[PDB]
Design a protein around this nucleic acid. Structure first.
Lengths: 360, 227, 451, 50, 136, 36
RNA sequence: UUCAUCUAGACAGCCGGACGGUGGCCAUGGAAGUCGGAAUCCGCUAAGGAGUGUGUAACAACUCACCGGCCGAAUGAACUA
RNA sequence: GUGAACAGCCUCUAGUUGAUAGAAUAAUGUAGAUAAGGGAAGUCGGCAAAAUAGAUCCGUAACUUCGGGAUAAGGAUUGGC
RNA sequence: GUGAUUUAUGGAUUAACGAGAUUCCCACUGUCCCUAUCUA
RNA sequence: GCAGUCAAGCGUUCAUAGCGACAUUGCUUUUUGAUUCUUCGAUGUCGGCUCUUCCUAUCAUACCGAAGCAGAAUUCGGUAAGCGUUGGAUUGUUCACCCACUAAUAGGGAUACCCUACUGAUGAAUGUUACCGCAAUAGUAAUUGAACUUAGUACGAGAGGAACAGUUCAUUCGGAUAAUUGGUUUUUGCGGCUGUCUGAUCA
């Protein structure tokens, strides 16, 4: 028989941060300009999608087929600083950080943990070190230009630009896949206190990796933890413990849309011709509205709603046809998931119901 | 006359359909059977990659002639639209509403006359004569009720399953108005509508169809310039 | 089974057989036993081991015996082929011996396992196990001799040509150094050697051809020497039994020429010796290698032999050769017709007008497809092939047909609104209907109805 | 198998083919947007500078 | 899956374990089936082998002609009585469980059919598509 | 690969000082057979 | 260790020679040095068997084992522990 | 009151409001329930759970110690004004 | 002694009845595929 | 098994005082597959599951060699344990042996709160508090079938007929997810119902 479990994710404990931390990146290619290797946003809900299908040879070629997607809030993302990393015979070593002369209340509120009692003195000496000349800064920058075979940039989100209310910014580091590390840090230095799209990293007809932390479910025992049957000790004998809130990594994820907040009628295919953003009736379920850019990707990401995720651009040069097919949407369901949704727009609600006692 | 193989199946008229003025084809697998048909006929008439509710089976879910065409309730606006865009407007197109949908299974038709179920509805029985100008008859063959499956017709000739007795053969040749033969296809495959297809200037059959079978269908359908 | 025997993979010698079985039973079954384990287990161990060895032995022997054809009452033809070729008595007694050995295997199995429930100790029971295994080994090394014969016949039986006597065939026979191999290779799809020596064809060689949409097989002879008229070697008896058993026609391939191992007078008397084997065979003789001789000038006594061939009811001379096609296919055709000789509804038109068939002008106007031409219609599978394979190519379903305009043929149908998608709306005169309601709202707007 | 040498090198030649070229053009395509975002924010900064 | 079954099968819900009675939609007069077996089976401990639409079985006839009773023969499922998902987006189901009889090759035993057959089996089996009076 | 078990040369006592204790008795048997 | 060969030319390696009655006897439909059984010799010979393998349906052709040449020092077989 | 009732449910007369409490909902337990599709395949084993169950109309076989079996089986019906 | 009836370690038989023991048919259903949820 | 033959060698030295290597011959229940339904004191307590890991002497899955291998598939053998080995029928009993599927359905071994192990969870001390990161080490997972093409290809006389590549689905396993569908109800949210209590409605 098989074993009622895997063995790879074996120390089934909770992770240490809700930010699932990037561990891998595709290595480099020092011929291109710089391309950001990752991005991050906040998962919001699911929808259903039909899609006409250019899949040569498949049974469903040139047919409509319904599939199911998710959605994530993807505001613009501002850069605040960089770090270098050098190869050793130990591994890698953080040797310098540098920050960007003016920092948001959000990230100042991240590094502090009890905000309002704080004097909010986070970088007041660093901005003073940003002198008339920036001498020490350029000292500790050109160092990295010399050293630091590979380099990362810090980001933070603009979370006030979401329906969510947490007030706090989720830092991260992001690796680059350009060359000319001097050019990398020069590019980033120009990008200091400057923000970046998600259609400026990704596009359609793309595959991604989705790394996040799962929904928690508490201390569920064997019968629902491992799907094991019901009536010294070894470490693979299917004993009860914590489920959920593990980190995971989900790959081979076909994007269909790279949305846009300013673009009205985000739910518009070529077919619908209806001025509706994808935010369906009722708001999202435990998430609010989508008045920003977004992504529509098939399958189902690890997470729960109003949870953060991190994105990576598939980490290698894929080989399957499905990694290269050309997407064409036909219709977005835009109904409320707060019930068995029937109607896309409240004007359609008015139209099919008619006028009512409260209407006049 | 040519034998032809769908993907590994010898039954053609379940996966494709023919008329004198056009031809239909499924999209299962790779684009080789369409090339097979156009190798014989070419651009003399439109040959159209078509589907029915995403199904491969047009050859038995459809019935028509060079004057008009019919499709059952299950087909979709997209396929209907594509049929009119592909085909010239000289030929009719129409979507039918019935209880049952096995149109090519239950219609063996040529350009002037066609046969149908006994229990088929009189509304569509009127409508088919309205759209095709053909004389309609509600009969069976040796008690075998599916008419569009076990018969293949043309204006040159026709064919029926082999179990038909000779009294049935003659009294049906009366109704059908071509010479008939109680014949076979692919070493005795009873299902002749799918085992082969025929119009006034071509026949198509599976690879298993033998040389006596080719000879009798060639004679009865009078297909070469010396028959 | 009739007309082919291929599902007999091999028969190994006795030493290979025992090595294979004993290795299999050392491998599969357990091997580790101590004394301190219990006596139920120690008996069960050796019992399972000997049972598995007998299982392997009989499982081999059933594939041996059932693989073989059991020639008795399969066909007189093939049975006589085996009689001339494969040493019938050796065959039957060998298979009977190994079947007896299978019974011996079962007997020693049942006797030992009848004993072994009373196994008491290792110096008794281990030796009992060795005793049973060596006894069946004694049967195996008793049965060494026939197995090489069985193998060498099995090598030949799979590579036999296959001819069913009940069907139409063409029994073509010619002399040694006659040109029958060249003739057969010209007429038929057949690989037979063309070096002009006597015993070139060694067995019943088959060649296929077509006539009147019928299949026909050509059975060649290795040559015959009937000088005792009772006994001939195993090569010569094969075609003899073929001419005896195969219920079909016979074609005599005559060569009245000096390029033979014997004179021409031997040919006619050989014909006379084989005369009684032409009972219902509808014989047809043909002369070959005739371009060099041109026998119209042939002498009076040899012409008298030619007439003296002709007392039997069915006989027919023809002349052909091995450089021209027309006469050889002619004699082939009428030989097939000799073998044949030995072997729908009406409309009534129920109408006043004729239903003529519709065949438009363009199907006749178009050219029949050329397989190879430098420029021709493209057979768009081959268009697909030169850009991607036959599975990977997406094809535009648009831009392959006629419309009012091909510019917007690639246009996207909207096909959808907020609700009530458009194909239930779509027809012409929709602007006319819009005006037909524009006038209506123009009526009702001014009447104060929408107060 | 996933990790057989035959399927692997047969996939490596194809990866060296169309797929990596699609990605190499995609990265320039997206570098265009990645660089013009700076121009959009900088002309916004010019609207601040005036 | 076996021979005759042109095209592949896409995953559908599974309603028919072994010992599941169903109707016989044929024109031979046979009335019912009792499944014993599946061809195209999965391998797992303690499982009940499942059949579904498009699948091909071995099974008996518990009621029908007596010459065919007390004998085993193949069959194809034609009606599922359980909800499935065609990718062209809809859930659906027929009411009753039914399976028709046919040779191991895929050729239909009887010459005709009563009642609806699913799109899946219709698309799959051409002899079903030729002998069938109905589709869905 | 999966490089297989190595059998010991440890003390592992049966063999060593008690079995050819009996094999000293086997030398006794050698003397007993040498009379013939 | 014991047998053997050896500058009166050791062994390796290259080349040639490797003949008759003979295609020896019946065997055979064909079997000639070798599908095969019996036998198995003599002339010349430096040497050459009624002929180890290659293989033709037969023949045929090729090689060593048997000898001589061209190079020149050691070398081979069996057995032991 | 209910209904066949002294079953069970609710209530008036009368009498307790005693049984260590509080905050939290993680599993698993203990008692109690529901689950599509199939319907005893599972299992030594229809163990347990579940099915009809009340009242009327018709009807209820063989077998018998003729007394029964018999609420046999099995079908229909059941509200309010 | 033995335990109703027909016809004495007691023989053939037997309607009803038994918290007596065994096989099978109907429907019934989480016993199971295949587990899920809710309540004190 | 027993009894010879052949007999490398051994024996104060040795055929013959005597052993003995490997093969061979002796029937051991029947020379023409006709069969024979032979289960002939199974005398022990395990049997049957939940379910983990290990061994290979591999049953398929890998790659290979040779076999009359023309092909398909098979017969053996080699490295190979990475991954897999089923649903039923029958006895208190493991003894005994069938049906069908699948690629195969190989063989083996190993009361319980108490301290330990296992599954999970906090945690002061490192001058503090916080953020981002490195990754010594440890574990590791994917599997198999079928199919369009190649291709009715070469090969074969034909019956037959794979292939490599390109391409799509599916099985068994694992991990996520709640769009949708179906299941679940103390939302006791909304209606409805029987008996009864607050005179009746209402609630």
């Amino acid at each position: 028989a098989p074993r009622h479990g895997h063995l790879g994710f074996l120390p089934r404990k909770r992770a240490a941060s809700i930010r699932a931390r990037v561990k891998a990146f595709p290595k480099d290619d020092r011929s291109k300009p710089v391309a950001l290797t990752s991005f991050l946003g906040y998962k919001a809900g699911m929808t259903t999608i039909v899609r006409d299908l250019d899949r040569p040879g498949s049974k469903f070629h040139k047919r409509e087929v319904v599939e199911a997607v998710t959605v994530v809030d993807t505001p613009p993302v501002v850069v605040v600083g960089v770090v270098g990393y050098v190869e050793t015979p130990r591994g890698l070593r953080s040797l310098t950080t540098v920050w960007a002369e003016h920092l948001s209340d959000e990230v100042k509120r991240r590094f502090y943990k009890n905000w309002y009692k704080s004097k909010k003195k986070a970088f007041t000496k660093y901005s003073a070190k940003y002198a008339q000349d920036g001498a020490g800064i350029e000292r500790e920058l050109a160092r990295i230009k010399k050293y630091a075979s590979v380099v990362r940039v810090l980001v933070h989100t603009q979370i006030r630009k979401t329906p969510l209310a947490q007030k706090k910014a989720h830092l991260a580091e992001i690796q680059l896949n350009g060359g000319s590390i001097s050019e990398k840090v020069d590019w980033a230095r120009e990008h200091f206190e400057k923000t970046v799209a998600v259609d400026s990293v990704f596009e359609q007809n793309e595959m991604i990796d989705a790394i996040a932390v799962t929904k928690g479910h508490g201390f569920e025992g064997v019968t629902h933890r491992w799907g094991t049957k019901k009536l010294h000790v070894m470490w693979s004998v299917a004993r009860a413990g914590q489920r959920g809130y593990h980190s995971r990594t989900s790959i081979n994820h076909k994007i269909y849309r790279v949305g846009k907040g300013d673009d009205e009628a985000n739910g518009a295919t070529s077919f619908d011709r209806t001025k509706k953003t994808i935010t369906p009736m009722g708001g999202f379920v435990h998430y609010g509205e989508i008045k920003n850019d977004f992504i529509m990707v098939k399958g189902c990401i690890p997470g729960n709603r109003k949870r953060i995720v991190t994105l990576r651009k598939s980490l290698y040069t894929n080989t399957s046809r499905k990694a290269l097919e050309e997407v064409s949407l036909k219709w977005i369901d835009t109904a409320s998931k707060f019930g068995k949704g029937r109607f896309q727009t409240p004007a359609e609600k008015h139209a099919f119901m008619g006028t009512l006692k409260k209407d006049l | 006359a040519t034998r032809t193989q769908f993907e590994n199946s010898n039954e053609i008229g379940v996966f494709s359909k023919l008329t004198n003025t056009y031809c239909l084809v499924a999209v299962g697998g790779s684009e080789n059977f369409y090339s097979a048909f156009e190798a014989e006929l070419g651009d003399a008439i439109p040959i159209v990659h078509t589907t029915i509710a995403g199904t491969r089976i047009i050859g038995r879910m459809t019935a028509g002639n060079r004057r008009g065409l019919l499709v059952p309730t299950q087909t979709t606006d997209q396929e209907l639209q594509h049929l009119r865009n592909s085909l010239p407007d000289s030929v009719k197109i129409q979507r039918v509403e019935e209880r049952l949908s096995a149109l090519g299974n239950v219609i063996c038709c040529n350009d002037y006359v066609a046969l149908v179920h006994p229990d088929i509805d009189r509304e569509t029985e009127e409508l088919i004569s309205d759209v095709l100008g053909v004389e309609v008859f509600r009969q069976t063959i040796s008690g075998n009720i599916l008419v569009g499956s076990y018969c293949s017709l043309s204006n040159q000739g026709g064919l029926v399953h082999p179990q038909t007795s000779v009294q049935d053969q003659e009294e049906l040749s009366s109704l059908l108005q071509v010479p008939l033969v109680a014949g076979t296809v692919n070493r005795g495959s009873s299902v002749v509508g799918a085992g082969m297809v025929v119009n006034d200037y071509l026949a198509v059959t599976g690879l298993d169809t033998t040389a006596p079978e080719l000879s009798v269908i060639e004679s009865i359908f009078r297909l070469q310039d010396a028959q | 089974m009739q007309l082919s025997w291929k599902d007999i993979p091999t028969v190994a010698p006795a030493n290979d057989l025992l090595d294979i079985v004993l290795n299999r039973t050392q491998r599969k079954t357990p091997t580790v036993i101590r004394p301190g384990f219990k006596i139920t287990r120690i008996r069960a161990f050796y019992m399972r081991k000997v049972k598995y060895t007998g299982e392997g032995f009989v499982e081999k022997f059933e594939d041996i015996l059932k693989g073989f054809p059991n020639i008795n009452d399969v066909h007189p033809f093939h049975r006589d082929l085996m009689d001339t070729l494969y040493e019938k008595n050796h065959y039957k007694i060998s298979l009977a011996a190994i079947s007896r050995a299978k019974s011996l295997v079962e007997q020693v199995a049942r006797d030992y396992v009848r004993l072994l429930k009373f196994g008491q100790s290792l110096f008794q029971c281990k030796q009992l196990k060795r005793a049973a295994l060596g006894r069946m080994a004694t049967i195996v090394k008793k049965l060494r001799d026939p197995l090489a014969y069985l193998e060498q016949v099995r090598q030949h039986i799979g590579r036999l040509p296959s001819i069913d006597p009940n069907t139409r065939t063409l029994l073509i026979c010619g002399y040694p150094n006659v040109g029958k191999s060249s003739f057969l290779r010209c007429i038929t799809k057949s690989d037979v050697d063309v070096q002009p020596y006597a015993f070139t064809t060694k067995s019943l060689y088959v060649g296929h051809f077509d006539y009147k949409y019928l299949r026909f097989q050509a059975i060649d002879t290795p040559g015959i020497l009937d000088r005792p008229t009772e006994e001939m070697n195993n090569i010569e008896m094969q075609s003899i039994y073929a001419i005896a058993h195969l219920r079909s026609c016979v074609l005599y391939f005559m060569d009245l020429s000096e390029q033979c191992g014997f004179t021409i007078e031997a040919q006619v008397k050989l014909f006379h010796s084989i005369k009684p084997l032409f009972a219902n065979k509808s014989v047809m003789v043909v002369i070959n290698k005739t371009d060099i001789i041109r026998p119209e000038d042939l002498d009076e006594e040899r012409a008298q032999l030619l007439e003296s061939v002709k007392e039997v009811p069915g006989v027919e001379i023809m002349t052909s050769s091995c450089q021209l096609e027309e006469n050889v296919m002619e004699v082939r055709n009428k030989a097939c017709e000799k073998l044949l000789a030995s072997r729908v509804a009406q409309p009534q038109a129920r109408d006043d007008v004729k239903r003529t068939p519709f065949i438009p002008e363009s199907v006749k106007n178009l050219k029949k497809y050329d397989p190879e031409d430098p420029n021709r219609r493209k057979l768009a599978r081959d268009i697909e092939a030169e850009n991607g394979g036959a599975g990977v190519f997406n094809v535009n379903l648009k831009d392959k047909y006629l419309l009012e305009d091909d510019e917007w043929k690639n246009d996207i149908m909207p096909e959808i609104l907020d609700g009530k998608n458009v194909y239930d709306f779509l027809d012409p005169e929709i602007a006319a209907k819009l005006q037909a309601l524009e006038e209506e709202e123009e009526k009702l707007e001014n009447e104060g109805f929408y107060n | 198998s996933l990790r057989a040498s035959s399927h692997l090198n047969a996939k490596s030649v194809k990866r060296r083919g169309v797929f990596q070229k699609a990605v190499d053009a995609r990265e320039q395509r997206i570098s265009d947007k990645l660089k013009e975002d700076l121009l959009k924010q900088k002309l916004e900064d010019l609207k601040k500078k005036e | 899956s076996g021979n005759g079954a042109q095209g592949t099968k896409f995953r559908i819900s599974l309603g028919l374990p072994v010992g599941a009675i169903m109707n016989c939609a044929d024109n031979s007069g046979a009335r019912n089936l009792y499944i014993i077996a599946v061809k195209g089976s999965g391998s797992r401990l303690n499982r009940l082998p499942a059949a579904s639409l498009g699948d091909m079985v071995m099974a008996t006839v518990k009621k029908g002609k007596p010459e065919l009773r007390k004998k085993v023969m193949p069959a194809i499922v034609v009606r599922q009585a359980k909800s499935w998902r065609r990718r062209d987006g809809v859930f659906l189901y027929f009411e009753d469980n039914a399976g028709v009889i046919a040779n191991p090759k895929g050729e239909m035993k009887g010459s005709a059919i009563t009642g609806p057959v699913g799109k899946e089996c219709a698309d799959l089996w051409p002899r079903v598509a030729s002998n069938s009076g109905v589709v869905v | 690969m999966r490089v297989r078990k190595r059998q010991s040369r440890r003390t592992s006592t049966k063999l060593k000082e008690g079995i050819k204790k009996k094999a000293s008795a086997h030398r006794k048997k050698e003397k007993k057979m040498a009379k013939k």
